[PDB]
Design a protein around this ligand. Structure first.
Ligand SMILES: Cc1cccn2c(=O)c3cc(C(=O)N[C@@H](C)c4cccnc4)c(N)nc3nc12
Ligand SMILES: Cc1cccn2c(=O)c3cc(C(=O)N[C@@H](C)c4cccnc4)c(N)nc3nc12
Ligand SMILES: Cc1cccn2c(=O)c3cc(C(=O)N[C@@H](C)c4cccnc4)c(N)nc3nc12
Lengths: 496, 496
């Protein structure tokens, strides 16, 4: 089956209200820049962002010019003329609206609180979808906390019920309405809802992992923001999932969640696959179309794993635009982020940047030796390894943030489509390297094993293996007279 | 409050049927050996063992001559003339009847299953108590498994109701009928029911911990069977409580259950006190009146912590009766167990045994240099430290197995009574030594702590301490925007 290729189309309210396809100074990436060829390379466009208002309903930003918003959306859905599989989703939430300290955060908490609120909120999602002509709903709440999770699940199940009814009512069996969420791609936020992943993902077509921003100026040491695999020379992190509300035993937590660990894309994917009832085909790997820049870095290792002097604040609390050559950093008053398009132009502009490659993480980076700068980003080469990982691990596909950051030729999108679909591309010998893999093991990714059937009445010694109720179990100590599952002495170590 | 001194009186069915007070070779320890002096030193005698039959009622062994049984019991209750506080309990169960592979185990499991079965079992316990003249009920099920614990708890509650009503009916307010159980003294069996200790202990007057047999021939290395504190030179063990079904986080399990650990009397007591709702006054420390012998120890340090050639099968499968001096080893055809009485006559009779002392564990042991022998046991000196521990930790008292193993003068029982009650004994300067203490922290031993109140909307760094909803919490990583208890990021570390 075709891998999903999910591109975010983000447009701020002031750009909707002043929308034009002819002046890149007010609208840098108008819908016009999505050519028929690029539309064929996408399977989904996530239009973003809508919000939940204090009426606990899905809504546009109050300052939106609704006439212009409908026209922007109509230009997007017109791209379906070039790609019959294309879906224009809309995204509710995002960091600014929905984070704990965000302007609308309470509206997310309250909308999922009660059966009445969830019914009302779900209806409004389907009404927005049908009124504007969208093809599905994406929820980007970053992120529900443990006690909010059951309400989150029931709202998603409510949306699933209404979308499946709307699919039948509209005769959309060939292209059913879809429901997705953006998921944490790092253990710290993932531990909020990790224990209920199975019930979260059940009503979804896809969970889109935000497997980027895994490094930033809020960390004391520079690092790669979307390392595929780990580098032993880089920083490691507390494994927050061992503290999730799982109810597992000490051995089960320990073998699933080594700590410290390397905060990588592979870690995020494997951590989802470790949960029973989380199918690989629904997991979608996010990739960034932007780089993160650091200043004040030391030398020796190309700016990698160095202390730095980058402000972590938001907004950027200065007027010092120190990322040399980055015109778009001036236009946006922040030198700590650059689009792939801009980085490509910084490279071919003789600004003293050097493009280096980390063969462990399988990601590129820029080093500026004169001014002490470090940029972590992804490109078409790092996407080869990520695409191969998606195929080997049988994931659902790829998601990226965001379309306006690709270069004008659409090279990053074309590469993702090529690695999944081009008949003359062949990655069977692509060397995935010796970077650190995530070695945790959980109930959902237990190895296949064989063992003699458990025999009631037997006394087992320490380390004995038996099969019982479809799993292979090992005794943790000696003189075991109880059945696996009936007593703390048995560890589930294998399936079938 | 006077400390309990609970002595098991164990008499097998063949000795009941053949009971006589004038022939040691048929009844080695008739009740007439319990003089008025000794009766005054006890608070309880646990007559043992009764059973649960296939009708799921408390019952004598079917081969018991019932008139002979009443006579033996009458000899015990006659002792109450010399001590108005003394109670003659009867014990239901024991290892042979109630272990998973024992002959009556299914009757324990099935008696506690439903309200009807529990009411029938409980009624039978009180009927037996009144019919034979006992003063209370002791249940020694070794040990209920996790799925049986709730029924076990409800059966104990039902017995408690019937006992309390019987106390009223009989005008026994001055000496009310009591309910006790034997509890596991090591973490392996403790883990079966650990999570429900509070509801198990609620209906009891006492839980008598079997804090002995903590070492034996079944282990690869010689060790003390009832060490008070740990010896760093000694073996350590897997802390099975970390695998109990508690629902705690990795950090919480790790701090409550260090592993490996020293398997000691102190460990068992502190493990019980770690659980909320378990009052120290109900905890009774078991001590052995017997030793365990190892055949084939190397030299080095008294035979402590070395390899051995002792079989670990029961029944004793062989015939090398190799514990020399020990004549009861021939009569009972097993050289690995010797009563204190016999161990004393071995030390008296020029057999080459040397008595040594471990000042970490505060226990004695015998070493034989020629035959390579090691014996771990308890004596009046080790009981000084255990009695002081009972007083310092405010435990309910002491229990021992069993009365027939004391010497003819009853020195062990007299020593326990002395250390609790003699005005001319003064342990105020007894130094408890530097042996390893169990230092796990759980809900029941959380310290008082003080921290500024949690303030919603603020972002906390790693290691921040705040007070919230009755507890002091610490963050496990940085950028914490959630409230404590509602999250994986917060660790309960203290009480307000
Ligand atoms: C300060 C801080 C602490 C911890 C986590 N943080 C974030 O996860 C975060 C995310 C974004 C954001 O917008 N990410 C983009 C890629 C995106 C795309 C699609 C859906 N959601 C988000 C942001 N601007 N600031 C952020 N700051 C923090
Ligand atoms: C508390 C206690 C009291 C009396 C006897 N006990 C045991 O006999 C015993 C045995 C084992 C064990 O596992 N194996 C033994 C059989 C073994 C294994 C391999 C070779 N030889 C012998 C054990 N774990 N605890 C045990 N506890 C006790
Ligand atoms: C083979 C084996 C494995 C694991 C644990 N085991 C035991 O814990 C055990 C205990 C006894 C026993 O009698 N203990 C006395 C002190 C007692 C006193 C009062 C109430 N209950 C018991 C026993 N004879 N064999 C036992 N074998 C084992």
């Amino acid at each position: 089956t075709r891998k999903a290729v999910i591109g975010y189309y983000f447009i701020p309210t002031n750009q909707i209200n002043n929308y034009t396809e002819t002046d890149t100074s007010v609208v840098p990436f108008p819908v016009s820049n999505i050519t028929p060829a690029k539309a064929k390379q996408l399977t989904h466009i996530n239009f973003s962002f809508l919000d939940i208002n204090s009426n606990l309903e899905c809504a546009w930003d109050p300052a939106t010019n609704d006439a212009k918003a409908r026209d922007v959306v109509n230009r997007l859905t017109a791209l379906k003329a070039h790609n019959p599989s294309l879906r224009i989703m809309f995204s509710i939430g995002g960091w600014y609206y929905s984070n704990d300290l965000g302007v609308s955060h309470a509206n997310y908490v309250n909308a999922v609180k009660t059966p009445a609120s969830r019914a009302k909120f779900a209806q409004s999602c389907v009404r927005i979808m049908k009124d504007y002509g969208f093809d599905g709903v994406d929820i980007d709440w970053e992120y529900p906390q443990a006690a909010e999770v059951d309400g989150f699940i029931a709202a998603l199940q409510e949306i699933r019920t209404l979308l499946n009814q709307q699919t039948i009512t509209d005769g959309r069996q060939a292209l059913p309405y879809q429901l997705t969420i953006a998921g944490a791609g790092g253990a710290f936020f993932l531990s909020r809802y990790y224990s209920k992943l199975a019930q979260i993902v059940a009503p979804l077509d896809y969970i889109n992992l935000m497997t980027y921003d895994l490094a930033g100026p809020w960390e004391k040491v520079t690092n790669h923001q979307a390392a595929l695999f780990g580098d032993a020379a880089g920083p490691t992190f507390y494994n927050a999932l061992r503290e999730a509300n799982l109810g597992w035993s000490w051995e089960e937590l320990t073998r699933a969640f080594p700590s410290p660990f390397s905060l990588t894309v592979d870690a995020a994917v494997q951590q989802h696959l470790m949960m029973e009832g989380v199918p690989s085909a629904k997991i979608v790997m996010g990739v960034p179309f932007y780089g993160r820049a650091f200043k004040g870095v030391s030398g020796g290792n190309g700016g990698q794993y160095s202390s730095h002097s980058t402000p972590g604040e938001d907004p950027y609390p200065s007027t010092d635009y120190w990322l040399v050559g980055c015109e778009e950093c001036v236009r946006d008053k922040d030198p700590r982020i650059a689009s792939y398009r801009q980085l490509e132009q910084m490279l071919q502009g003789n600004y003293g940047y050097q493009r280096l490659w980390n063969d462990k993480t399988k990601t590129p980076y820029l080093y500026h030796a004169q001014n002490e700068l470090f940029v972590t980003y992804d490109d078409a080469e790092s996407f080869k390894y990520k695409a191969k990982y998606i195929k080997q691990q049988q994931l659902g596909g790829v998601m990226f943030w965001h379309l306006g950051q690709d270069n004008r030729n659409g090279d990053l999108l074309a590469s993702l489509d090529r690695y999944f679909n081009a008949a003359d591309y062949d990655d069977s010998q692509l060397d995935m390297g010796t970077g650190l893999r995530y070695t945790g093991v959980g109930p959902g990714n237990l190895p296949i094993m064989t063992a003699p059937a458990y025999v009631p009445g037997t006394t087992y010694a320490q380390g004995a293996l038996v099969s019982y109720q479809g799993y292979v179990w090992q005794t943790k100590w000696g003189y075991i007279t109880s059945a696996p599952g009936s007593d703390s002495a048995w560890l589930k170590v294998g399936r079938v």
